[PDB]
A paper describes a structure:
Tryptophan Rich Antigens (TRAgs) are encoded by a multi-gene family found in all Plasmodium species, but are significantly expanded in [name] and closely related parasites. Potential candidate proteins include the Tryptophan rich antigen multi-gene family (TRAgs), which all share a Tryptophan-Threonine-rich domain of unknown function (PFAM ID PF12319, OrthoMCL ID OG6_145873), usually at their C-terminus. We show that multiple [name] TRAgs are expressed on the merozoite surface and that one, [name] binds red blood cells with a strong preference for reticulocytes. Using X-ray crystallography, we solved the structure of the [name] C-terminal tryptophan rich domain, which defines the [name] family, revealing a three-helical bundle that is conserved across Plasmodium and has structural homology with lipid-binding BAR domains involved in membrane remodelling.
Numbering used by the authors: 460 to 691
Write the structure that this text describes.
Amino acid sequence: DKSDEWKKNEWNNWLIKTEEDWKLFNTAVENKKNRWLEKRDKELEVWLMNMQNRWLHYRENEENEYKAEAMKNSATWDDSQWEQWIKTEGKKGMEADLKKWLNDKETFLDGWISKEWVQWKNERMLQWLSVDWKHKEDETFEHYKSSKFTNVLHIKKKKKWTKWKERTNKEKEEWNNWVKGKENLYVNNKWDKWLKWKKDKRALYSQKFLTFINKWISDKQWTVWIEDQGGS
């Protein structure tokens, strides 16, 4: 039925609407990312409260290499050696736990956002490829050499095949260029807000660790660890 020029214009209008629809998708993604980051504020605050409470005790059902490394000296260490340990190895363990918490959240974020983009791109592509006249011409020309060549000699190509191949080639190139202009937002993406959030939380929580360590020392909290482990 329809001419090659009509089919070109149908693609042009479809790409315009796709760019418009992308703006709504991107706004929804940004809103979801911002709300996710807000919820990490709450989760990090809860995480710190739980970690601090865990450092108050060393019950016999706990397996912890850091606490064992200190407690194998618990018969011989004076106060100054407990203080030196918590300020060096104690803080190093708290910093390592926070580092892996942040890496875990970064891993989830990248997988979640990248998969939403993969899904959206494909939903878009399926919408175009399943258009009735588009699916029809693609089935006609992709699978049969009968529709490509004028006769069994397989020399001269049919005019309509050439029109289809040239049109679909250029539209695939346009689509690929459009996708590559947006892909960096979701794939291997550097989210500056998350990077600044990580650096700010590391600095704040490092000082929170030091404040907690000072209280642990002032309360001689290792005496509770010893009693938890059976000591008198």
